[PDB]
Design a protein around this ligand. Structure first.
Ligand SMILES: [Cl-]
Ligand SMILES: [Mg+2]
Ligand SMILES: [Mg+2]
Lengths: 231, 111, 241, 240, 244, 235, 243, 195, 250
């Protein structure tokens, strides 16, 4: 009310309204799902168009050969944060000949987002990210919120009506976690998960976006006719 | 006075055919009259079907190859995984090299 | 009325932020007192440790700024420690630059100048503290100099600070009316500490255990704080008279 | 450094600081530009609430940017000096690097760019000035007349006016200027310019300034008597 | 942050006026009147001191009239402290020009630069403008004798006769009435004093409430002399014209 | 007042949303993409008859293979075009090749959110970027001050956009010829424009692989206008 | 009024309302504690299991500074990480110049001054965390608790978060019942019990226990996480006491 | 670098400047004009390090032209020479100084007098009846010391100048490929085409 | 972080007033009375030492300060603001004058420098004006003795005699009746003490009054001999005893 003019102001109950309004931009964003087994990690994203004449806004971005994310909210902010991750992954490779741990990737994003919530003039990032990766400790899935909070999960979803997929994955937990050494089945579980967040619209060929990374699989994205297999 | 350059010896050779190309190089690495390694490769696969060698001062050679390999990586990121053509790679390497015009990479480069 | 939020003048020529910083001074509800002997300067302060979980040895508002200078603070501990660290750095730099130990009054002026800046510059708030500096200066002898959020400072024959400062002040005034001198006419610092505690007891009307007090003593070439047992030894001496 | 974003969007999509800068232009003395077949004429109103003026030394309303291009304006006088100075410096810088004087379009484009920059830079307000820039490109005999405004938009005009009561004189020019046949001579162009100012001015005494620019750096300012002859001639034809 | 307390000194009103410039001019209208009159053989500067006290040291005082160089002087109306900042800048600027070209600075060039500095404070920096209006009186070999005025907006204009500060409306009407082009310095001296005497808010115009100066070619052959009048000289010139 | 980079309670940036209102006040610009080329057309909208309309420059070349049309506060577009041209030429210098249309658009859109308390406010202009490259062929992009860009088969921006877009929804198909697209832009511009459409108050342009980006002459457009009127009367 | 709208502004009381508002954010956070023992310190924290989908043991909240200091906090988690990052920079520069690892009181003031600095200007926001931290140095064991204002003290036991009062009451009993001292292995067990008892104030979601410790004898003066057999033993001890 | 001469007579200033541009063992050009018009009645000839000469000359030209437009007025030759001197005096203590020597010939319209200023790269200014830079002076000054009168006509000055060029063409080691001669007087600047 | 206050805190109101300067002058009005009187062979500046507590040692707080050997200053208003102005004034006398000309600045020019510092606090970003009016007395070879008043705006005026602060209105009227152009230094000291008694309420002695003069050179206060041209400071602070001697023949 009187305490939402900027990020540097606390409300009387200890809330940061600008951070909460940034969180609100994610809720308006199109649904995206993340889930993993012990061998692979999968991102599934529902893309959104302006109208029937327009393209479908790309939701998934590659960060390294072993890491990448999906976005929900302000896309330019995702570009800034993904670019930062690309550099951090790259620094680790050039300087230490070391693939950046997915956990460190999360810590780095948390700290970058945090600085924008404590200083005057700046604004919080207006996007949520789901980071998947395969490193020296196996497969990983992270959830980034622009409050700074990063959380490691077996599965999750963010965006509009993400609660449907999140409930589904919570039920399916014991099943999909043991889909080891089978990419197509782990994707099928993710495609079924994102289907619980659909209303009036269904998954088409230029609507669905899937990404996968794993033990013997570099981070690769599937669009167009390559996702027809899963509809 | 500190001399930032050295000579690691060796020699390289590139020949082009009709539908192929070779880039060869000996694996010996030296300083003065001593052998450092009998097998230290200096011809590298940089991706996008480009092979590269920067022969002369190995520290500069490795740095340049490292930078170009990284340039290929970012070319993909910035231009929708487009393949870097050999002519585009050549022009890119010119800028890498000339960027250090007043403190040169002490190498002869072939791709 | 934004003239009450930053350090600019109000229509009546006042600086409300400075005035409110003065009120922060009493937020700890602790009273301090300083007196001078012939050879020494004694400062005492109440020590209130309400929480049982606190480590009482770490609860202190007296600071050793340099080997010769001590400082007691009336105000919240974060601002108190901010002032202490700066004072320590200033005293150290002075010695390096000018080849001799920073005098108590010069440090007081310097810290007062820094405080003044916060009353004139908008981006910096005043510290909600009152700083009492004590030493036995090699030129001026026993010295008490006190700084406040307005940037004011002055030397003292003796002084007191806190919520019940006026009672202690008049108590000391009445003694110096009687004694007719500028200091406590006593040889040992031990008895000057005893005087300080005695007159604080009379003014406040409370009794003190060894853990209810905190004592700093400045002599030639060193300032030091007393342990609980040093104070207990001192409390026993008062009781047996 | 002072950083405040002074020029910002409002809910309806307007930048009020830019729009209020236009109000400053509307307050300024009227300025008019008319281009003929072989010349451009810049006319300027001078308010007569100021007697005891020294016209020798008082800043003239029309300024030479180079020997071949001129700039008049409407709005804040102090603001205009900053634009004129920058324009003059760029004129010499262009001659130095390109080895050719500026085109009137280029000079206009530069001045307009400066004005635009002040509408989305922190800590600055927009220029309270609109300009009329006129002249001839090097080795060219085609007349050029351009207009700029605080927002930064610029465009070419066969004839145009800016400042107070400019809507009245624009009305006049819109029915009195034939695109198919522009004022064929210098005399015709000056007369149409003087006529248009007489719709708004008051007395044709020391209230009107006229500057004539012809090809190949041929710029001259008319004196009182020369202008007064146009005023005298127009009024006698009017009584009919 | 600090946005809360920003007055925004360099913005436009909905009508297209600069608030702070307008309010600075309002401030200047309460300052003591200063008059400049340009004759064919010299210039007069006359200014009224702001309500004087009898214990003020009058001879070693300078409030209204300042020397910029040997050929140029200014009359001040507004905040004196603000004026001195600008005066020192103007003095330095004149010397920079002399150092560069080995010629005394033309009056307009000096006036323009000082006016440009004022302009800057109205367009950028977020600072309050200088609450000062100048009357510049000077000579150079291009235009001869010149009078200018500048105000907080940074706008300057040339004049034959002009007033700044208090009662300019009444003062300008009186100057416009009695001024003519073939006027001499001694006539201009009389007009300046007569105008102040009628427009003053005081009971009667006396020597102790005035500063006076002339810029003549009344030295010896083709050179200019600045005369900042002493108290006794103002007392005499006030008697000579029959005001006291 | 309030921060320039402030979020609304609905999760949108106030300044970005307000700049979108400025663009709605702008003159209409339409783009249609075909397999034979991309056509760009704009309403000039002269504020007065004395203004020489050919000096109104709302269609602009970025490189030989990329063109651009604008709508809104058109003065704001100058630095966007300058950046686009430099980005295009710089890439050619570094890589001895033409830069992809999408990469160009992304580079322009990187400027968009570089405002706050960088420039003081967002851009008040939307761009239609049309071009060709070897990888993705003929492309049309709509670049907004939000920093977002969509690829379009056809798109209208400006005051008559929502009406024109609805018309483009019906008319566009994947087999349109270049000539068909030219007429379609003219037709839809004539529908949403205030004043009557002619060669002086509307401008056409196109980009083809063979001839690159070309702005049409007033003579060429006039014949396409005459061809359009005759075809509508013919049934 | 309006005194609470800007950081570093004194109210007529002499208070900085913005700091007090940051304290509300801390009170909203999960419970964390610190127990000082014979030759070291023990840290524990409540991790609310929001969902089944959280990977157990893999969202670590306790942080190490240098090799001998542990830090835990309640409130805005990102703010706590920022403070630890600074703490690590401070500890590194101390060791760089002075060779010896940073003493705990020295380290405590480094954080204190930094947090206090964020109450001096309106262009920064106060920290939305209370931080419990400590370790072992040349003078033995030290436990500290730092608040948004920059205020910190040494503690025998410390607690912050939603279940601070419950935890404090339980801490006070240990101090009374063990005047001679508590052992490191005992303090680990007690820490588990207190987190479980403090969980009653946050009992909708069930939780995950996390413990760490520094001890001169048990961990050789270095910070280590309690895992495996020692953790499960501590969990079982806590489970037995609630029933 | 090469022969720049200057002679101030009764009513005009005459500047003669060699036409050769030599680099190594090759004369690259034999028609080079080593001069710039700073204003209608002010001409500057220049001579020194390659590149520096023209870069400096044109920079000065731009500044004087900028001044002319701003004030709608022509600076006096004295004022221009002082500006030029200061620029060189700044330059000599820069990281890389301008190695350029100049002569400034001007006609002061207010004084109705010709004026010749000699300024070297250090910023050493002198007003002279006749001037030269480089080795040229070693030959021509004794010749001018003898034959020069302050009341000479422009024609007499040109004959005096022919005598200097003849002496230089006889005793100088290089072929400087003749001179371009320009006259500065009340009517401005004009070039003598047949010399 | 960093000083984000890069804008003026003193601005013109619609009526033309500079609010913060007016309010600073109001703070000066509340301040304790100080005065200055110029004689033919010297200048006297005086003020009351308002003690904050009887436990305070008012000797340690100096309201009258030496700026140069021939210039002294006193004030009315906010003490802390005055203290830092004296520090800056002493330094600027060296940096912008003595280190250039090898001699101390004349009174008018040092005053001019202090005025500049006070003017800048009225226009620069993120600062309030100084809440003091200064009276600066001094001597220099070519101007003789002088007395100046400097206000929060940065304006300065030369005075024959004047007062500032609490009871300045009455004190100025008192000085008008007594001042003539033939006053000797001792006569001016006498009048200064008389004028000050009117505004002082409590104790009136050498311990509650602070008074200094600018008069003859004091070779005994120089600290060295051997250089004939160096003859000692003209500024001298009267002792507590010296004041009481003159209060008997009052
Ligand atoms: Cl200091
Ligand atoms: Mg402040
Ligand atoms: Mg020479």
């Amino acid at each position: 009310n009187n305490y939402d003019g900027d990020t540097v102001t606390f409300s009387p109950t200890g809330r940061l309204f600008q951070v909460e309004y940034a969180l609100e931009a994610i809720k308006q964003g199109s649904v995206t799902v993340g889930l993993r087994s012990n061998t692979h990690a999968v991102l599934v994203a529902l893309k959104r168009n302006a109208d029937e004449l327009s393209s479908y806004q790309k939701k998934i971005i590659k960060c390294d050969e072993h890491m990448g994310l999906s976005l929900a909210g302000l896309a330019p902010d995702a570009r800034v944060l993904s670019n930062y991750l690309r550099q951090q992954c790259n620094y680790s490779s050039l300087v230490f000949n070391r693939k950046l741990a997915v956990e460190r990737a999360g810590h780095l994003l948390c700290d970058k987002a945090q600085k924008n919530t404590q200083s005057y003039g700046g604004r919080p990032y207006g996007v949520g990210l789901l980071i998947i990766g395969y490193d020296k400790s196996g497969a990983h899935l992270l959830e980034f919120q622009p409050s700074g909070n990063v959380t490691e999960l077996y599965g999750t979803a963010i965006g509009a009506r993400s609660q449907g997929a999140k409930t589904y994955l919570e039920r399916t937990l014991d099943t999909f976690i043991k889909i080891d050494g089978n990419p197509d089945e782990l994707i099928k579980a993710g495609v079924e998960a994102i289907s619980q967040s659909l209303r009036d619209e269904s998954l088409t060929v230029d609507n669905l976006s899937i990404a996968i990374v794993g033990k013997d699989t570099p981070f690769t994205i599937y669009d167009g006719e390559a996702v027809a297999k899963y509809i | 006075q500190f001399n930032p350059y050295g000579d690691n010896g060796g020699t390289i050779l590139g020949i082009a055919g009709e539908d192929f190309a070779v880039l060869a190089g000996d694996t010996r690495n030296i300083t003065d009259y001593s052998i450092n390694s009998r097998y230290e490769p200096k011809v590298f696969d940089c991706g996008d079907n480009i092979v590269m060698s920067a022969n002369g001062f190995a520290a500069d050679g490795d740095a340049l190859v490292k930078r170009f390999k990284n340039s290929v990586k970012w070319y993909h990121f910035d231009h929708n995984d487009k393949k870097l053509s050999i002519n585009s790679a050549a022009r890119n390497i010119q800028h890498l090299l000339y960027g250090k015009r007043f403190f040169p990479y002490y190498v002869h480069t072939i791709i | 009325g934004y003239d009450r939020h930053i350090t600019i003048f109000s229509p009546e020529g006042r600086l409300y932020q400075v005035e409110y910083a003065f009120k922060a001074t009493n937020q700890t509800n602790i009273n301090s007192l300083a007196v001078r002997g012939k050879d020494c300067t004694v400062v005492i302060s109440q020590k209130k440790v309400p929480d049982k979980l606190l480590d009482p040895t770490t609860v202190s508002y007296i600071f050793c700024i340099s080997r010769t200078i001590g400082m007691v603070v009336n105000g919240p501990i974060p601002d108190a420690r901010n002032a202490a660290l700066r004072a320590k750095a200033e005293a150290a730099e002075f010695r390096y630059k000018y080849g001799y130990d920073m005098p108590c009054d010069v440090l007081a002026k310097r810290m007062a100048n820094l405080s003044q800046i916060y009353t004139q510059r908008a981006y910096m708030r005043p510290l909600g503290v009152i700083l009492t500096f004590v030493s036995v200066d090699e030129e001026l002898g026993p010295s008490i100099y006190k700084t406040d959020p307005a940037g004011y400072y002055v030397g003292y024959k003796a002084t007191a600070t806190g919520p019940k400062q006026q009672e202690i002040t008049t108590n000391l005034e009445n003694h110096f009316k009687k004694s007719k001198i500028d200091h406590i006419n006593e040889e040992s610092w031990e008895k000057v500490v005893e005087f300080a505690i005695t007159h604080m007891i009379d003014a406040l009307g409370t009794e003190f255990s060894k853990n209810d007090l905190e004592v700093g003593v400045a002599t030639k070439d060193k300032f030091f704080t007393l342990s609980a047992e040093n104070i207990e030894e001192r409390l026993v001496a008062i009781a047996e008279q | 450094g002072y950083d405040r974003a002074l020029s910002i969007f409002s809910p309806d999509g307007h930048i009020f600081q830019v729009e209020y800068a236009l109000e400053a232009v509307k307050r300024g003395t009227c300025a008019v530009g008319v281009k003929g077949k072989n010349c451009v004429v810049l006319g300027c109103e001078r308010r007569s609430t100021l007697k005891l003026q020294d016209t020798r030394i008082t800043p003239s309303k029309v300024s030479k940017i180079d020997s071949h291009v001129v700039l008049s304006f409407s709005g804040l006088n102090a603001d205009s000096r900053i634009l004129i100075e920058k324009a003059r410096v760029e004129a010499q810088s262009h001659r130095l690097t390109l080895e050719d004087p500026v085109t009137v379009e280029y000079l206009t484009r530069y001045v307009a760019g400066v004005q635009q920059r002040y509408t989305q830079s922190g800590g600055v307000r927009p220029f309270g000035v609109s300009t009329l820039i006129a002249g001839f490109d090097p080795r060219d005999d085609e007349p050029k007349l351009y207009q700029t405004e605080p927002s930064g938009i610029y465009s070419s005009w066969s004839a145009q006016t800016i400042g107070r009561n400019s809507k009245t004189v624009r009305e006049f020019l819109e029915k009195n200027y034939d695109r198919k046949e522009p004022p064929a001579t210098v005399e015709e162009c000056v007369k149409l310019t003087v006529r248009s100012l007489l719709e708004v001015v008051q007395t044709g005494a020391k209230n009107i300034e006229i500057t004539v620019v012809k090809p190949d750096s041929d710029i001259v300012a008319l004196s009182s008597e020369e202008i007064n002859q146009y005023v005298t001639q127009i009024e006698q034809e009017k009584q009919e | 942050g600090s946005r809360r307390y920003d007055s925004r000194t360099t913005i436009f009103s909905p009508e297209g006026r600069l608030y702070q410039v307008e309010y600075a001019l309002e401030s200047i209208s309460h300052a003591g009147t200063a008059i400049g009159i340009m004759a064919s053989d010299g210039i007069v500067l006359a200014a009224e001191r702001k309500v004087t006290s009898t214990l003020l040291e009058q001879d070693t005082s300078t409030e209204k009239l300042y020397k910029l160089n040997d050929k140029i002087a200014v009359a001040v109306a507004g905040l004196t402290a603000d004026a001195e900042i600008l005066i020192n800048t103007a003095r330095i600027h004149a010397q920079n020009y002399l150092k560069t070209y080995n010629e005394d600075i033309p009056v307009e060039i000096l006036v323009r630069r000082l006016s440009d500095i004022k302009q800057g404070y109205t367009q950028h920096g977020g600072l309050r403008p200088f609450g000062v209006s100048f009357i510049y009186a000077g000579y150079d070999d291009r235009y001869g004798y010149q009078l200018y005025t500048s105000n907080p907006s940074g706008n300057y204009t040339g004049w034959k006769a002009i007033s700044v500060g208090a009662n300019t409306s009444a003062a300008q009407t009186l100057l416009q009435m009695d001024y003519k082009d073939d006027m001499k310095v001694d006539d201009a001296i009389e007009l300046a004093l007569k105008t102040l005497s009628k427009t003053t808010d005081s009971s009667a115009l006396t020597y102790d409430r005035l500063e006076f100066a002339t810029i003549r070619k009344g030295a010896n052959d083709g050179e200019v002399y600045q005369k900042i009048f002493k108290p006794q000289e103002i007392k005499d010139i006030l008697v000579k014209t029959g005001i006291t | 007042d309030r921060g320039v980079s402030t979020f609304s309670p609905e999760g949108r940036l106030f300044q970005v949303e307000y700049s979108l209102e400025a663009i709605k006040l702008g003159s209409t610009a339409i783009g249609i993409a075909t397999k034979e080329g991309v056509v760009l057309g704009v309403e000039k909208r002269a504020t007065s008859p004395l203004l020489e309309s050919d000096s109104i420059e709302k269609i602009v070349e970025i490189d030989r293979h990329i063109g651009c049309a604008m709508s809104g506060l058109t003065a704001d577009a100058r630095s966007m075009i300058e950046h686009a041209r430099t980005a295009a030429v710089t890439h050619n210098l570094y890589y001895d090749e033409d830069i992809n249309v999408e990469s160009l658009t992304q580079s322009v859109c990187d400027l968009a959110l570089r405002f706050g308390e960088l420039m003081s406010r967002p851009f008040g202009v939307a761009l239609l970027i049309a071009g060709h490259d070897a990888d993705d062929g003929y492309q049309l992009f709509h670049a907004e001050p939000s920093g977002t860009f969509y690829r379009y088969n056809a798109k209208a921006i400006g005051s008559g956009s929502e009406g024109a877009q609805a018309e483009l929804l019906n008319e566009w198909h994947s087999s349109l010829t270049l000539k068909e697209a030219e007429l379609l832009v003219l037709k839809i511009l004539k529908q949403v424009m205030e004043e009557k459409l002619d060669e002086n108050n509307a401008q056409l342009s196109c980009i083809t692989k063979q001839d690159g980006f070309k702005i049409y002459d007033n003579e060429k457009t006039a014949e396409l206008i005459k061809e359009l009127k005759e075809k509508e009367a013919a049934e | 009024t309006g005194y609470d709208l800007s950081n570093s502004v004194f109210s007529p009381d002499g208070r900085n309302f913005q700091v007090e508002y940051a304290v509300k954010a801390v009170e909203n956070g999960t419970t964390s504690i610190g127990i000082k023992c014979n030759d070291g310190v023990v840290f524990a924290v409540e991790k609310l299991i929001t969902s089944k989908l959280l990977v157990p043991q893999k969202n670590v909240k306790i942080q190490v500074v240098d090799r001998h200091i542990g830090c835990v906090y309640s409130g805005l988690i990102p703010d706590g990480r920022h403070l630890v990052n600074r703490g690590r920079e401070e500890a590194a520069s101390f060791k760089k110049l002075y060779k010896t690892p940073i003493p705990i009181p020295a380290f405590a003031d480094r954080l204190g001054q930094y947090v206090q600095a964020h109450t001096l200007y309106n262009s920064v926001r106060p920290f939305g965390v209370s931080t419990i931290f400590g370790g072992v140095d040349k003078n033995g064991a030290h436990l500290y608790m730092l608040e948004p204002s920059g205020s910190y003290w040494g503690y025998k036991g410390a607690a912050t978060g939603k279940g601070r009062q419950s935890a404090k009451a339980e801490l006070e009993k240990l101090v009374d019942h063990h005047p001679e001292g508590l052992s490191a292995r005992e303090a680990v067990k007690q820490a588990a019990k207190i987190i479980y008892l403090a969980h009653e104030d946050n009992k909708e979601k069930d939780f995950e226990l996390e413990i760490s410790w520094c001890s001169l004898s048990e961990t050789n003066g270095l910070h280590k996480f309690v895992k495996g057999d020692l953790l499960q033993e501590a969990i079982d001890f806590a489970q037995k006491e609630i029933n | 670098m090469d022969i720049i001469l200057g002679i101030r007579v009764q009513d005009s200033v005459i500047l003669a400047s060699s036409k050769a541009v030599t680099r190594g063992i090759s004369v690259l050009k034999d028609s080079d004009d080593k001069t710039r018009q700073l204003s209608p009645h002010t001409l500057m000839s220049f001579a020194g390090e390659a590149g520096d000469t023209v870069q400096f000359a044109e920079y000065i030209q731009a500044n004087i032209q900028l001044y002319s437009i701003r004030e709608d007025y022509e600076l006096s030759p004295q004022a221009v020479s002082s500006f030029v001197r200061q620029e060189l005096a700044k330059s000599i203590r820069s990281r890389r100084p301008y190695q350029v020597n100049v002569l400034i010939g001007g006609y002061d319209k207010k004084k109705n007098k010709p004026e010749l200023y000699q300024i070297d790269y250090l910023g050493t200014k002198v007003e002279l009846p006749y001037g030269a830079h480089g080795y040229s002076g070693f030959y021509t000054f004794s010749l001018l010391d003898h034959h020069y009168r302050p009341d000479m006509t422009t024609e007499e000055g040109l004959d005096l100048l022919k005598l200097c060029v003849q002496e230089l063409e006889k005793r100088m080691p290089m072929d400087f490929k003749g001179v371009i001669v320009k006259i500065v007087d009340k009517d401005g600047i004009r070039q003598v085409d047949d010399f | 972080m960093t000083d984000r206050y890069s804008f003026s805190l003193t601005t013109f109101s619609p009526s033309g007033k500079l609010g913060q300067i007016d309010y600073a002058l109001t703070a000066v009005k509340q301040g304790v009375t100080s005065l200055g009187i110029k004689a033919t062979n010297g200048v006297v500046i005086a003020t009351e030492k308002k003690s904050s507590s009887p436990l305070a040692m008012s000797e340690t707080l100096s309201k009258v300060s030496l700026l140069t050997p021939d210039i002294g200053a006193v004030y009315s208003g906010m003490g802390p603001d005055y203290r830092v102005l004296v520090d800056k004034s002493r330094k600027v006398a060296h940096t912008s004058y003595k280190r250039i000309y090898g001699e101390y600045p004349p009174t008018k020019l040092l005053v001019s420098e202090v005025a500049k510092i006070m003017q800048e606090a009225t226009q620069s970003g993120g600062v309030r004006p100084f809440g003091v009016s200064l009276l600066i007395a001094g001597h220099d070879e070519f101007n003789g003795f002088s007395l100046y008043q400097v206000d929060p705006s940065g304006s300065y005026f030369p005075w024959k005699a004047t007062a500032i602060g609490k009871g300045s209105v009455a004190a100025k009227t008192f000085l008008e009746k007594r001042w003539n152009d033939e006053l000797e230094l001792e006569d001016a000291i006498h009048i200064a003490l008389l004028t000050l008694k009117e505004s002082v309420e409590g104790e009136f002695n050498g311990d509650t009054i602070e008074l200094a003069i600018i008069g003859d050179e004091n070779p005994d206060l120089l600290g060295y001999t051997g250089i004939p041209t160096d003859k000692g400071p003209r500024f001298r602070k009267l002792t507590s005893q010296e004041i009481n001697d003159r209060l008997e023949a009052l």
